[PDB]
Amino acid sequence: CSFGGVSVITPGTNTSNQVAVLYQGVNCTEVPSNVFQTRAGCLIGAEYVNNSYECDIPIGAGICASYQTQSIIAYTMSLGAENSVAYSNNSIAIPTNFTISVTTEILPVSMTKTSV
Amino acid sequence: DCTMYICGDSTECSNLLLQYGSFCTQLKRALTGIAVEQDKNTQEVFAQVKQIYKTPPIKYFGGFNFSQILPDPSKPSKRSPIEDLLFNKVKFNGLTVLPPLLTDEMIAQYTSALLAGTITSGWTFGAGPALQIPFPMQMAYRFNGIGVTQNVLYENQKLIANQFNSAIGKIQDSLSALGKLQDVVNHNAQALNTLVKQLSSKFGAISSVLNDILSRLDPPEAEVQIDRLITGRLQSLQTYVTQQLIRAAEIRASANLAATKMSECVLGQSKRVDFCGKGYHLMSFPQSAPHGVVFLHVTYVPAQEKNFTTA
Amino acid sequence: GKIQDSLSALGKLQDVVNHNAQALNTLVKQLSSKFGAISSVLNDILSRLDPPEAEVQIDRLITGRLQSLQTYVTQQLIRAAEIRASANLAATKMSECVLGQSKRVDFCGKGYHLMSFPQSAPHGVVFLHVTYVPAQEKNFTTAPAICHDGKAHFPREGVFVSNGTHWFVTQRNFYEPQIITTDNTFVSGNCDVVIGIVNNTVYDPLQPELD
Ligand SMILES: *[C@@H]1O[C@H](CO)[C@@H](O[C@@H]2O[C@H](CO)[C@@H](O)[C@H](O)[C@H]2NC(C)=O)[C@H](O)[C@H]1NC(C)=O
Ligand SMILES: *[C@@H]1O[C@H](CO)[C@@H](O[C@@H]2O[C@H](CO)[C@@H](O)[C@H](O)[C@H]2NC(C)=O)[C@H](O)[C@H]1NC(C)=O
Ligand SMILES: *[C@@H]1O[C@H](CO)[C@@H](O[C@@H]2O[C@H](CO)[C@@H](O)[C@H](O)[C@H]2NC(C)=O)[C@H](O)[C@H]1NC(C)=O
Ligand SMILES: *[C@@H]1O[C@H](CO)[C@@H](O[C@@H]2O[C@H](CO)[C@@H](O)[C@H](O)[C@H]2NC(C)=O)[C@H](O)[C@H]1NC(C)=O
Numbered sequence: 082c083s084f085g086g087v088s089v090i091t092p093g094t095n096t097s098n099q100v101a102v103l104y105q106g107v108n109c110t111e112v113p114s115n116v117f118q119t120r121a122g123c124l125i126g127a128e129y130v131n132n133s134y135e136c137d138i139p140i141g142a143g144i145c146a147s148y149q150t151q152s153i154i155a156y157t158m159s160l161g162a163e164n165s166v167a168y169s170n171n172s173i174a175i176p177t178n179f180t181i182s183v184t185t186e187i188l189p190v191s192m193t194k195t196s197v
Numbered sequence: 198d199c200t201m202y203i204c205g206d207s208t209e210c211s212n213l214l215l216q217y218g219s220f221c222t223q224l225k226r227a228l229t230g231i232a233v234e235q236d237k238n239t240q241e242v243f244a245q246v247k248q249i250y251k252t253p254p255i256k257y258f259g260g261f262n263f264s265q266i267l268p269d270p271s272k273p274s275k276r277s278p279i280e281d282l283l284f285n286k287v288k289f290n291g292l293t294v295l296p297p298l299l300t301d302e303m304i305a306q307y308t309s310a311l312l313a314g315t316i317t318s319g320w321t322f323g324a325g326p327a328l329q330i331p332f333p334m335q336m337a338y339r340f341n342g343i344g345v346t347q348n349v350l351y352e353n354q355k356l357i358a359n360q361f362n363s364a365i366g367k368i369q370d371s372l373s374a375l376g377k378l379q380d381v382v383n384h385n386a387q388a389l390n391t392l393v394k395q396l397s398s399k400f401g402a403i404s405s406v407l408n409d410i411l412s413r414l415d416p417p418e419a420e421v422q423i424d425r426l427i428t429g430r431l432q433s434l435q436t437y438v439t440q441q442l443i444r445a446a447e448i449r450a451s452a453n454l455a456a457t458k459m460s461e462c463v464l465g466q467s468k469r470v471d472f473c474g475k476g477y478h479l480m481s482f483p484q485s486a487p488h489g490v491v492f493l494h495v496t497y498v499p500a501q502e503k504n505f506t507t508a
Numbered sequence: 509g510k511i512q513d514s515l516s517a518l519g520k521l522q523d524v525v526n527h528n529a530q531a532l533n534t535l536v537k538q539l540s541s542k543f544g545a546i547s548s549v550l551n552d553i554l555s556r557l558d559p560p561e562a563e564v565q566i567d568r569l570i571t572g573r574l575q576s577l578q579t580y581v582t583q584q585l586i587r588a589a590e591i592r593a594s595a596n597l598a599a600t601k602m603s604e605c606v607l608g609q610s611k612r613v614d615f616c617g618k619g620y621h622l623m624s625f626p627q628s629a630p631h632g633v634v635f636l637h638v639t640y641v642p643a644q645e646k647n648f649t650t651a652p653a654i655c656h657d658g659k660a661h662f663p664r665e666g667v668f669v670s671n672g673t674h675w676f677v678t679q680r681n682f683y684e685p686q687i688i689t690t691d692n693t694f695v696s697g698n699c700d701v702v703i704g705i706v707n708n709t710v711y712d713p714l715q716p717e718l719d
């Protein structure tokens with residue numbers, strides 16, 4: 082008999098009170114607007130589009146969602162901007178300028194010492 | 198599902214299980230930690246490229262023939278010939294398997310972007326903009342990095358390209374190995390087969406079925422018999438989750454090594470001994486495998502020495 | 509200066525605090541559980557029961573709470589191995605990113621490593637990675653070698669480029685062209701083995717000094 086966990090997909094309570102719910106590997110005909118069937122379960126409360134954006138709230142198996150435009154949406158995430166390198170058999174590209182960048186990296190080193 | 202594993206359907210059990218506190222909350226929190234890290238492990242190994250690079254239509258790089266590692270346009274999956282071999286070698290009582298966030302098509306797209314970036318711009322795209330340079334000249338810089346003078350390639354370009362093409366061709370013969378990938382599958386399958394089998398144990402009770410107890414016994418004594426079974430099966434879940442945490446730390450350490458090699462063997466040239474294959478590192482090409490990564494290490498090996506007198 | 513704006517991130521440090529706080533809050537809450545006994549308080553048992561039966565009820569509670577301690581300590585050992593592995597990585601970067609210059613790709617930030625500065629954080633370390641990033645590329649035509657007097661010339665360091673009408677030698681990381689001379693290049697082999705070699709003039713400083 083079908084079953085599974087129930088998890089709500091909220092876009093931050095600070096920006097909205099809407100929510101969508103994914104029923105993991107539950108068919109949308111056996112759950113009991115915007116109903117979308119995916120191979121990862123039944124997605125309710127978000128409309129599925131064919132465009133692609135950067136992952137926002139991972140839903141699983143390639144799908145995501147996020148407040149759009151005042152709404153929640155799902156979509157097949159895109160892997161990144163596409164770009165062709167202008168390769169040829171006698172062409173080269175050399176920089177003529179540069180910048181100095183600074184980036185952070187954070188690492189934990191210790192925990193609190195406990196005794197019972 | 199803690200309640201469906203232990204009790205199982207019965208509802209008289211649910212009120213008894215609530216009397217043990219938050220053990221079922223601990224199991225869900227512990228397993229969620231693992232579930233989130235396993236998707237991050239994959240992103241850190243493969244999602245090291247901003248843009249999705251493509252090779253030019255001609256696909257002829259001064260001779261070198263890379264058709265065995267580039268995607269095959271005549272396939273629904275767009276895998277490479279070698280990736281097709283790599284994937285050809287490897288529900289219950291409250292148990293479920295969740296799907297990965299990234300499909301294997303998406304992973305193939307990260308691998309083809311790393312291949313297209315490297316073959317056309319070498320290691321420059323990992324530090325900034327991709328800078329094109331002819332591939333034959335890329336190989337000559339790589340010999341220079343290991344202390345070989347660059348005319349050795351330019352005067353012998355055809356020999357090196359032909360010898361490379363056969364040397365990479367031999368890789369398929371050695372495949373048509375992946376025991377490290379099958380072991381991961383086996384270890385989880387064995388823990389799930391054992392977890393289910395542990396439900397057919399009496400643990401010293403009159404029976405092993407929480408409904409049969411009631412059918413042939415009064416409540417005062419049935420609460421004791423069901424409490425014994427609950428304790429036994431709750432111990433089963435604690436054993437299961439503890440081992441998944443210990444084993445997830447090992448695959449995480451492996452994903453960290455694979456991500457480090459992806460940066461240092463594929464996006465650049467390393468001087469670290471034996472870190473990028475046997476011999477003097479020239480270059481490496483990634484391939485996708487199920488739940489893993491395969492590195493094709495290209496090395497420089499000297500041959501045919503003569504002895505001389507020196508001073 | 510932009511680094512402060514990005515701060516005014518540290519979720520990896522808050523997670524360490526949260527994980528221990530959650531294990532200590534759970535360990536205490538597990539004392540209010542009966543584990544199938546008549547009560548959960550070892551004094552109340554005696555107050556309303558004889559010893560022969562009170563020993564059994566207290567032994568059940570002891571077993572339950574002793575299991576709680578075994579769960580707690582086992583998880584602290586497994587979690588301490590993870591923070592230890594992180595401290596080993598931080599110590600390794602302290603040596604290799606701060607006390608020297610590394611050639612390891614992506615080990616000391618994104619770009620070409622120049623230098624790093626440490627900062628102290630609560631229960632952790634922050635690395636400020638200074639990197640070299642090239643910018644504003646132009647495309648050029650290139651060739652592996654140049655022919656002069658029937659001999660092949662190869663660059664000592666750098667690449668040959670063409671601006672459309674003349675050829676120059678440049679260093680590979682910054683565009684800075686110089687004229688191709690006999691002090692910039694070396695000779696090896698003849699122009700019959702190099703594929704893509706081009707004709708140009710390589711200037712000898714000796715003859716114009718001797719007029
Ligand atoms: C390299 O880049 C810098 C900018 O990052 C250029 O410096 C600027 O030059 C403009 C004039 O072109 C000035 O108005 C700015 O004040 C300069 N900025 C700084 C911070 O000094 C530099 O000229 C570039 N080099 C080349 C050769 O184009
Ligand atoms: C790259 O190598 C492949 C083989 O790995 C070449 O494809 C084969 O070419 C032979 C003839 O040389 C044919 O008999 C095979 O049928 C080809 N195989 C396939 C799958 O088509 C390919 O031609 C090489 N590319 C270049 C540019 O030389
Ligand atoms: C390539 O650069 C050269 C050198 O700057 C340009 O050629 C001219 O060279 C003479 C000396 O032989 C100089 O006196 C001129 O000032 C140069 N002209 C210019 C415009 O710089 C040549 O024009 C450049 N080629 C292209 C296509 O821009
Ligand atoms: C580069 O210069 C050399 C030397 O002038 C050229 O070699 C000549 O090639 C022609 C045919 O193109 C022959 O008739 C001559 O006998 C060659 N000269 C010598 C001294 O061997 C060479 O062809 C030039 N390369 C290009 C691409 O123009």
Ligand SMILES: *[C@@H]1O[C@H](CO)[C@@H](O)[C@H](O)[C@H]1NC(C)=O
Pocket residue numbers: 095
């Ligand atoms: C959310 O609200 C807090 C104040 O409660 C504010 O500091 C923060 O900037 C807000 N976040 C966004 C994205 O607006």
Ligand SMILES: *[C@@H]1O[C@H](CO)[C@@H](O)[C@H](O)[C@H]1NC(C)=O
Pocket residue numbers: 108109110118119
């Ligand atoms: C759900 O059931 C319908 C039939 O009632 C079927 O057409 C559909 O494919 C099912 N969905 C899934 C995800 O299996």
Ligand SMILES: *[C@@H]1O[C@H](CO)[C@@H](O)[C@H](O)[C@H]1NC(C)=O
Pocket residue numbers: 129130131
């Ligand atoms: C997305 O594209 C597919 C074809 O690739 C089409 O069948 C489907 O209807 C499209 N979805 C929407 C919401 O338009």
Ligand SMILES: *[C@@H]1O[C@H](CO)[C@@H](O)[C@H](O)[C@H]1NC(C)=O
Pocket residue numbers: 502503504
């Ligand atoms: C060099 O000479 C030694 C003996 O001094 C010999 O053992 C060795 O095989 C020789 N190497 C070659 C390549 O002949």
Ligand SMILES: *[C@@H]1O[C@H](CO)[C@@H](O)[C@H](O)[C@H]1NC(C)=O
Pocket residue numbers: 167645646647
């Ligand atoms: C160099 O030329 C290629 C086309 O051959 C073009 O795509 C690329 O944008 C050019 N690079 C620059 C900096 O103009």
Ligand SMILES: *[C@@H]1O[C@H](CO)[C@@H](O)[C@H](O)[C@H]1NC(C)=O
Pocket residue numbers: 170171704
């Ligand atoms: C580069 O390829 C073109 C054809 O696309 C050809 O005309 C040209 O001769 C090639 N250059 C070299 C150096 O082989």
